[PDB]
Design a protein around this ligand. Sequence first.
Ligand SMILES: Cc1cc2oc(C)nc2c(=O)o1
Length: 289
Amino acid sequence: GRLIYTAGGYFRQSLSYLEAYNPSNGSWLRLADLQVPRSGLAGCVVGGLLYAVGGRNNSPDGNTDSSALDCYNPMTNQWSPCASMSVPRNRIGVGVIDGHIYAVGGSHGCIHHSSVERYEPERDEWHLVAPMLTRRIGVGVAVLNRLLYAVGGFDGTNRLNSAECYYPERNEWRMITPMNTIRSGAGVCVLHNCIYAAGGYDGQDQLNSVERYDVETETWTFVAPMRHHRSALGITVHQGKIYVLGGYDGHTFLDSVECYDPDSDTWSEVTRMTSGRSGVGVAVTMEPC
Ligand SMILES: Cc1cc2oc(C)nc2c(=O)o1
């Protein structure tokens, strides 16, 4: 569609914000709050509905990992509960294939999931599928050519440079070439024939580096670094450009939104979020009403 939606996030505590940015005019619009605050969630879109998946409510009243799937209809500006996942998944990644949502990895307390499940909107049902070969929280996920990729994250002990691919017709995961950089909480998306991994945390520092995996050549190549180091950034693609939203730079919860032009191999600032935050869910769909 036409707007970049950012849902939830973290600053001091987990947030309920839903706001939409319009690249055509620079404008932000505040929309209906999530029913439950959450950070470390993912967003995605199916049939012009926006979905918020997993996360955790870090609050003064306590900390609750989320198994929730919630449905936002832009035509009505209302959130509806959808069926919950088998398990809470904080710092989750999601991918959409053929109108179905895959929920990948994430944590529940000290449990670091390798498990994966798939939601079918027409049935309002989740079903488990084959688990990843590695436990991954803070995992990045993207879809290219109807294959699902899980990239980086943290396995409970080490931050990971590894990545793997799920072949739905085989219900099977296989390792791909590892990244050149260890990354937990990177932004992962697809542009053209490449899976991009932007930023994240290597166990030491927040990263500004960006690298991309060419599915044909099976190699990762660095492109230009972002203007800001960031972990727990939101990422999405809007009209052939990658947008990265917020995150944490080791000092500040960023309001910076940056945009990547792959033809010039340059990042630039495009706007600021209305407030700095990390761990947001991001997706693109039609403008409301
Ligand atoms: C994902 C992640 C973990 C983390 O732990 C610490 C101590 N800092 C960070 C960060 O920026 O990002």
